[PDB]
């Protein structure tokens, strides 16, 4: 149908905008702490602690399959990255601190993203 195509074009354009958001958030992680999944070879107990691991490469795979239907879904995954880290790592660690700084800096980007998603529809 033509309606199905129009819906698909909307999803494609959301995917465009989420890719730009993802790039901007990942620049706020210059140490690349959140770039890849926590290695289960190197942290063998991780899944005992963290039930839904997340990282920027995993988000990018979902994004490129157009697997985010709305900004809420994308933010859910970003918040997992931060929240998983702040639970597994203690306050005094470079990991925890990196997450706090990513959260704080990403907030600004996500605030305007929400306006753009609503604005463009």
UniProtKB/Swiss-Prot annotation:
Organ and tissue specificity: Highly expressed in testis.
Cellular localization per UniProt: Nucleus; Chromosome
Domain Bromo: 9-113
Positions bearing the Glycyl lysine isopeptide (Lys-Gly) (interchain with G-Cter in SUMO2) cross-link: 41
Quaternary organization: Component of some HBO1 complex composed of KAT7/HBO1, MEAF6, ING4 and BRD1/BRPF2. Component of the MOZ/MORF complex composed at least of ING5, KAT6A, KAT6B, MEAF6 and one of BRPF1, BRD1/BRPF2 and BRPF3. Interacts (via PHD-type zinc finger domain) with unmodified histone H3. Interacts (via PWWP domain) with dimethylated and trimethylated 'Lys-79' on histone H3.
Function: Scaffold subunit of various histone acetyltransferase (HAT) complexes, such as the MOZ/MORF and HBO1 complexes, that acts as a regulator of hematopoiesis. Plays a key role in HBO1 complex by directing KAT7/HBO1 specificity towards histone H3 'Lys-14' acetylation (H3K14ac), thereby promoting erythroid differentiation.
Listed name of the protein: Bromodomain-containing protein 1
Organism this protein belongs to: Homo sapiens
Gene (UniProt): BRD1
